[PDB]
């Protein structure tokens, strides 16, 4: 069974090729139109940051899913928060346990680092993403409203 | 008012950062709260990805907000996440929160960011009322999930 072959890996600084592969998976799975990938100098800078962690799911050397996360150091606690910003699984591999393994590995990593909490969000209209998140034993869920300002 | 000043905190502003944290504790009615040690708070203030704005009447902090820079992989232009915003209860509904948002967006515009965002709980009418008054570009209904770690 694939469970005995799937590997979850946290990307290191030499993993720009795998990071680009995951961004391409995001482009495909989120159906991003007219996307121009940032230059590799920028993506390398991001991968080098101490507050950004990428996890990928691999079968052989093929990336079948992954997630991105940001560290938010807190002023209320000495234990940080982690914000999972994106998670996606290749459409051919969905509903096979990969997303759950990615969440498990991510939360294990941040537990070992002494973080307080990990969080992730889904759009109210995204039935697929909500059903997934509700299957990962989250501590709680809350309805929230997101506001943004597009800058000039 | 013209006496109101908006200040972006710098690395020599730990005392004002602590006053803003205490304002948060009071305005959010935070429970079972013990402030981190000042070594920790100074290290956070010194981060290149964290910016605090405060509102002052003379020496008194009457509101403020905190924000995190999120460098993107979909764009070279970054995002800013406004994490907390509060105004002292005695000074609310006098334009202070709107002035803080304006100053924050102006700052991130000058630095070439793509977008600033902020969130409110769906049950929090007061915070939803305030955010909608700041003329945001759009709003979206989302579900927030958290995992409390051992
Ligand atoms: C116009 N500027 C935009 C900016 O407002 C923001 O829009 C977000 C929107 O795409 C998100 O839904 C997409 O995102 C993902 C994961 N990446 C999965 C499903 C996708 N349909 C939504 N959850 C939050 C929205 N705020 O991010 C994109 C942007 C181009 O920067
Ligand atoms: C148990 N772990 C906790 C973690 O889940 C989280 O709880 C959040 C709670 O404070 C927030 O309430 C405050 O939000 C703010 C801004 N600070 C102003 C209005 C307040 N009502 C609520 N909006 C969302 C909750 N998830 O923060 C504390 C924690 C200890 O880390
Ligand atoms: Ca393209
Ligand atoms: Ca460039
Ligand atoms: Ca100052
Ligand atoms: Mg085209």
TrEMBL record, chain A:
Residues annotated as binding Ca(2+) 6: 39, 78
List of residues binding CoA 1: 87, 89, 94-97, 99-100
Binding sites annotated in the UniProt record for Ca(2+) 5: 35
Binding annotation for Mg(2+) 4: 39, 78
Source lineage: Bacteria, environmental samples
Positions of Ca(2+) 4 binding: 34
Binding site for Mg(2+) 3: 34
Coiled-coil regions, chain positions: none
Protein name: AAC3-I
Residues annotated to bind CoA 2: 89, 95, 97, 99-100, 131, 135
Residues bound to Mg(2+) 2: 13, 48, 50
Residues annotated for Ca(2+) 3 binding in this entry: 15
Protein residues bound to Ca(2+) 1: 9, 15
Record's keyword annotation contains Membrane: no
Residues engaged in binding Ca(2+) 7: 78
Amino-acid positions noted as binding malonyl-CoA in the UniProt annotation, renumbered to this chain: 87, 89, 95, 97, 99-100
Binding positions for Ca(2+) 2 per the UniProt entry: 13, 48, 50
Residue numbers binding Ca(2+) 8: 152
Assigned keywords, A-Z: Calcium, Metal-binding
Protein residues bound to Mg(2+) 1: 9, 15
TrEMBL record, chain B:
Residue sites binding Ca(2+) 3 per the record: 13
Oxidoreductase keyword on record: no
Protein residues bound to Mg(2+) 4: 37, 76
Residues given in the record as Ca(2+) 6 binding sites: 37, 76
Annotated binding of Mg(2+) 2, by residue: 11, 46, 48
Record: residues binding Mg(2+) 1: 7, 13
Binding site for malonyl-CoA: 85, 87, 93, 95, 97-98
Annotated residues for binding of CoA 1: 85, 87, 92-95, 97-98
UniProt binding sites for Ca(2+) 5: 33
Keywords noted in UniProt: Calcium, Metal-binding
Positions contributing to Mg(2+) 3 binding: 32
Residue numbers binding Ca(2+) 8: 150
Chain residues that bind CoA 2: 87, 93, 95, 97-98, 129, 133
Binding site for Ca(2+) 1: 7, 13
Residues binding Ca(2+) 4, per UniProt: 32
Positions contributing to Ca(2+) 2 binding: 11, 46, 48
Residues holding Ca(2+) 7: 76
Name of this protein: AAC3-I
Species this protein is from: uncultured bacterium
């Amino acid at each position: 069974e694939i469970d005995n072959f799937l590997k979850i890996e946290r990307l290191a600084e030499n993993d720009l090729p795998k990071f680009i592969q995951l961004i391409r998976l995001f482009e495909a799975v989120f159906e991003m139109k007219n996307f121009s990938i940032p230059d590799s100098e920028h993506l390398q800078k991001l991968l080098n940051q101490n507050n950004f962690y990428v996890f990928v799911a691999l079968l052989e050397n093929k990336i079948v899913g992954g997630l991105t996360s940001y560290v938010l150091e807190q002023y209320y606690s000495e234990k940080p928060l982690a914000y999972i910003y994106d998670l996606a699984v290749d459409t051919n591999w969905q509903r096979q346990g990969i997303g759950k393994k990615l969440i498990t590995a991510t939360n294990q990593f941040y537990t070992e680092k002494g973080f307080e909490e990990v969080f992730v969000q889904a759009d109210k209209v995204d039935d697929y993403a909500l059903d997934f998140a509700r299957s990962t034993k989250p501590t709680a869920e809350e309805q929230v409203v997101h506001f943004y300002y597009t800058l000039k």
